[PDB]
């Protein structure tokens, strides 16, 4: 209107140009697929980082198939994760690795605790935590060979007496997946997808874009209105 | 549609 | 061995408390009117943000506001007319805090990129570029707050606080001894001493030239989130995640009064005060706002707008209040 | 009787659909912004069928008193509202199927297609698609008085020399673009979501997972059924009576009414099934 | 061990400090609030005259 003097009008366009600016970053942020990436540093995180792209929060740009990923790693926060937590509620999606050959190794603190049981209970409180209700979970079991060339020479009824299988590969790691995917409380809106390492070439990212794809889909169920 | 074409009646 | 001694020192600390507590703030109250309803409504609606708004603050003109949302943006509001007076971009999108600089020239944010990042405001080149950034802390930077334009002191997850010289870029005081995560950080008006609370439940009082702390506060069962001075700066109040407030004072080395509710159970992210002391504000977590009486402990007034958690809460300097919600709205009242 | 039952027929259908479609609109006004591409879908497709429903009453009167009573400039507004909005509903109908098409089976590319300035340029297109049809029945649309049966009856005009080809032209090419295009657009689309649905691994992974990708199913068949039953009769009626043979009987004509009257149920209840039935919808209004 | 004595020397500190009644600290906190309770605008509603928040 021509209330506004000369200098109010040119403060309203800077105001409009400004939110142009504004809505076209957000158009181009909310084409981006965010993953957390969680688990431990001793269970391997670092190679799946470098398998996949080839100092508080380590970011990761990758495109793969024409998607933008971001990975953030808080591998590097010695806090809380109960204050922190909450800002990944919208994360797209949740990578949680665990080494299989640490089944039997102590933690290194002085206390006798299994390093598979504290994966486990980490899995757990971040599984059913209130932030990721339904929040998809990739299960990254890693170290395979290490796992298995070691399961030939220790039972895995150590880590826990209720595995009465037989010592071979396939029946433990089977049992191991079975094991983490029972702690899933809420087994309706959240799935879990469990996939060993395999250390090849666009083999674990194929299967990270995979579980993207179906939580898109999703997503854009819930945009129509017919989920 | 149709209530608007050269009906014979 | 000295375990006994320290337990002896706390016992004679918790009597010294008791003995001074000869009256009650509730009684010595009753001869004060109550204040009323406060009813107030959403005269502004700033937009343009779209994640989760984690904290604002105010000018020091009461006119300009800076605002930080999770989508790595440092927005500048006129709140009279509505407008954005800049739009920062952050190089790391998870930001818990933000600050104004008294002069209007600086603007602080920091959070899990455990780094303190400074924006000058009034560069010639006519667009706002990175001045300094403090990367000396080892958790996430929880909040932070402008001494002058070369000082500013910020809280971190690693239990520690931060005073820093920002033309040199390195910490010149190191404030330590919490055994939580410090959430929550507030500076006395005359900017000499300031206070802090964490997630131990305790809020300690520091001293900015001695750089040691003075007194420990105690009584809240869960995290402390927030933290705020009274504007005589001898009191402050904190907000923790057992739906409590409580009104500590220094002189008085002890809580004063608790503002709490029975059918409130969500805790409290951010407190404020108004430009007399009299009204507490304190945003929750059942999407809505209370406004307390700061003498009476009753619940004045309620402010409902937002549809998710209200994350940060702000009271002008002459008292002419924003609430930033995980609505992606900021909300002037 | 038939007439009676037939006119109540026109009242109740002409009723719930200009209700359901006003309080569509009224809601996405105000109630709903108008941030996303469905809701503009919506919008656009409700304002169709309340335009569409707005043409019933002119012709319960042309099916009541034989005749035309209104002045020329009206019966050609009318015409020209009637196909326009009909062409424009059929096509926002063809584009939602394709936009849930999209975000199924192309979920990388719908994060660049389902930008609601597409949706808007998308609706654009289609109205000034239609605006074709739109000009051709202002331009062609009036009243003629015929003497030896002394009615004055409102239609497309066309030259006499070949009235009957021009006629059977128009009507063929609206039966393709209106119904053959477009039902063969949404079977496929539909079809096609729907198979890829069966291979999501969230839809199959739980028993209530399961039941809601049996209530998606169900929908979207109950979507094609409802546009099927309510457009195929009219079609084929006209078709039959345009090329197969002529004749004028009474029941005929009820017969023929009807099937206009179930043509225009499918506009009103494109409201209920579009708009009643979508979970954001529903959220949004509670 | 060290932690401890830490902790001793800091609660040393902490308990040699002054303190007065809470009932001088009650009757401050009330002088302050009724002091400068008419340049509160929230708590006295301002006139649309004087709010720069105009409608
Ligand atoms: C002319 C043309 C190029 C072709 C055409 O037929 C239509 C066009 C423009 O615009 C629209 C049409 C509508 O049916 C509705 C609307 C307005 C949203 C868009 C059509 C139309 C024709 C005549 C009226 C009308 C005349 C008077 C009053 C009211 Cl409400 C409508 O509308
Ligand atoms: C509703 C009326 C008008 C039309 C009927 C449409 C439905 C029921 C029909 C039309 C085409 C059909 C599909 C044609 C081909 C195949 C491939 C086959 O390997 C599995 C079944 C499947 C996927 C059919 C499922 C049923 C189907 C979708
Ligand atoms: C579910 C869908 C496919 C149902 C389709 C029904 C169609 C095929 C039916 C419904 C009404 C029918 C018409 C009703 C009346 C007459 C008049 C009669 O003298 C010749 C046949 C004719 C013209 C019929 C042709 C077939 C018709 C159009």
Same mark, same amino acid.
């Given at each position: ?8 009008k ?38 799946? =980082? ?40 919208? =994360? ?9 050959s640490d089944?039997?190794?102590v ?43 070691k ?7 150590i ?6 299988g ?22 309706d809106?959240?799935?879990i ?11 674990? =990212? ?22 | ?9 | ?57 105010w ?16 927005? #500048? ?80 997850g ?7 010289? #920002? ?7 190191? $404030? ?7 959430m ?14 964490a997630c ?16 420990? $506060?105690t ?10 001075? $009274?504007?005589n ?20 080395d ?24 009299? %009204? ?22 309620? %402010? ?30 | ?41 919506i ?16 012709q ?19 015409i020209?509202?009637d ?7 059929? @096509? ?38 239609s ?91 109950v ?13 084929? @009626?006209?078709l ?18 009807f ?28 | ?7 001793? &020397?800091?609660?040393?500190? &902490? ?39 105009? &409608?």
């Amino acid at each position: 209107g021509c209330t506004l003097s000369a200098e109010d009008k040119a403060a309203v366009e800077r105001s409009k140009m400004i939110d142009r600016n504004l809505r076209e970053d957000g158009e181009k942020a909310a084409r981006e697929v965010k993953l957390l990436l969680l688990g431990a540093g001793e269970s391997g995180k670092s190679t799946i =980082v470098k398998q996949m792209k080839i100092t508080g929060i380590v970011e990761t740009h990758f495109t793969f198939k024409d998607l933008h990923f971001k990975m953030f790693d808080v591998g590097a926060q010695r806090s809380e994760r109960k204050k922190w937590i909450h800002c990944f509620e919208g =994360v797209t999606a949740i990578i949680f690795c665990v080494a299989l050959s640490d089944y039997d190794l102590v933690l290194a603190e002085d206390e006798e605790m299994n390093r598979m049981h504290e994966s486990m209970k980490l899995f757990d409180s971040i599984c059913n935590n209130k932030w990721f209700t339904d929040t998809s979970i990739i299960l990254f079991l890693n170290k395979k060979d290490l796992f298995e060339e070691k399961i030939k020479k220790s039972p895995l009824t150590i880590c826990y007496p209720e595995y009465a299988g037989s010592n071979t590969y396939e029946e433990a790691a089977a049992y191991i997946q079975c094991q983490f995917e029972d702690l899933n409380k809420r087994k309706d809106t959240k799935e879990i997808y469990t996939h060993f390492t395999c250390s090849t070439d666009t083999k674990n =990212v194929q299967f990270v874009f995979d579980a993207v794809t179906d939580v898109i889909i999703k997503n854009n169920l819930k945009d129509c209105g017919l989920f | 549609y149709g209530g608007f074409l050269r009906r014979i009646r | 061995q000295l375990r006994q001694e320290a337990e002896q020192l706390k016992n004679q600390i918790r009597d010294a408390r008791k003995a001074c507590a000869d009256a009650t703030l509730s009684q010595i109250t009753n001869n004060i009117d109550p204040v009323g309803r406060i009813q107030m409504r959403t005269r502004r609606t700033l937009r343009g943000h779209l994640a989760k708004i984690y904290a604002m603050h105010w000018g020091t003109d009461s006119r300009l506001l800076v605002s930080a949302s999770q989508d790595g943006k440092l927005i #500048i509001w006129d709140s009279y007319t509505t407008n954005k007076v800049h739009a920062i971009p952050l190089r790391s999108s998870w930001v818990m805090t933000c600050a104004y600089a008294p002069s209007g020239n600086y603007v602080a944010c920091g959070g899990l990129d455990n780094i303190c990042s400074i924006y000058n405001l009034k560069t010639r080149e006519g667009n706002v570029r990175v001045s300094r950034e403090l990367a000396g802390h080892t958790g996430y930077l929880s909040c932070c707050r402008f001494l002058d334009d070369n000082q500013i002191v910020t809280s971190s997850g690693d239990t520690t606080c931060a005073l820093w010289d #920002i033309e040199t870029g390195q910490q010149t005081t190191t $404030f330590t001894g919490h055994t939580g995560d410090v959430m929550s950080l507030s500076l006395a008006p005359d900017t000499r001493l300031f206070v802090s609370g964490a997630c131990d439940a305790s809020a300690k009082l520091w001293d900015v030239r001695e750089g040691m702390c003075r007194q420990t $506060f105690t009584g809240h069962e869960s995290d402390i989130n927030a933290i705020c001075f $009274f504007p005589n700066g001898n009191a402050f109040a904190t907000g923790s995640d057992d739906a409590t407030c409580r009104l500590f004072d220094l002189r008085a080395d002890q809580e004063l009064m608790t503002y709490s509710h029975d059918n409130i159970i969500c805790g409290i992210t951010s407190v404020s005060f108004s430009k007399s002391g009299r %009204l507490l504000l304190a945003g929750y977590d059942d999407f809505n706002c209370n406004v307390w009486d700061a003498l009476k402990a009753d619940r004045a007034g309620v %402010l409902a707008g937002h549809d998710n958690r209200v994350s940060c809460l702000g009271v002008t300097d002459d008292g002419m209040v924003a609430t930033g919600s995980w609505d992606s709205f900021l909300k002037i009242w | 009787a038939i007439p009676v039952i037939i006119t109540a027929v026109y009242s109740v259908v002409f009723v719930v659909g200009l209700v359901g479609n006003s309080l569509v609109m009224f809601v996405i006004i105000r109630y709903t912004k108008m941030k996303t591409a469905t809701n503009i879908y919506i919008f656009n497709l409700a304002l169709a069928d309340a335009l569409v429903t707005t043409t019933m009453p002119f012709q319960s009167t042309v099916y009541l008193m034989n005749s035309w009573p209104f002045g020329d400039v009206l019966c050609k507004i009318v015409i020209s509202i009637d196909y326009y909005n009909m062409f424009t509903s059929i @096509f926002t109908l063809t584009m939602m199927s394709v936009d849930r098409y999209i975000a199924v089976c192309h979920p990388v590319k719908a994060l660049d297609f389902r930008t609601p300035l597409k949706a808007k340029i998308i609706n654009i297109c289609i109205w000034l698609l239609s605006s074709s049809v739109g000009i051709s029945a202002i331009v062609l649309g009036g009243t003629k008085v015929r003497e030896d049966v002394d009615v004055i009856e409102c239609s497309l005009q066309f030259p006499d020399d070949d009235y009957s080809w021009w006629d059977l032209f128009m009507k063929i090419c609206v039966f393709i673009f209106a119904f053959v295009i477009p039902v063969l657009i949404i079977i496929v689309c539909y079809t096609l979501m729907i198979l890829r649905l069966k291979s999501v691994r969230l839809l199959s992974g739980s028993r209530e997972k399961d039941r809601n990708l049996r209530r998606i199913t169900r929908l979207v068949l109950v979507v094609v059924a409802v546009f099927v039953v309510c457009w195929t009769p009219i079609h084929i @009626f006209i078709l039959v009576e345009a090329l197969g043979s002529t004749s004028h009987s009474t029941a005929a004509l009820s017969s023929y009414y009807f099937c206009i009257a179930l043509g225009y149920t499918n506009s009103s209840l494109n409201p209920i099934l579009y708009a009643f039935l979508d979970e954001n919808f529903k959220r949004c209004f509670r | 061990i060290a932690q401890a004595r830490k902790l001793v &020397e800091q609660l040393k500190m &902490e308990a040699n400090i002054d303190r007065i009644k809470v009932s001088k600290a009650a009757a401050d906190l009330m002088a302050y609030c009724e002091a400068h309770a008419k340049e509160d605008p929230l708590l006295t509603p301002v006139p649309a005259s004087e709010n720069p928040f105009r &409608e």
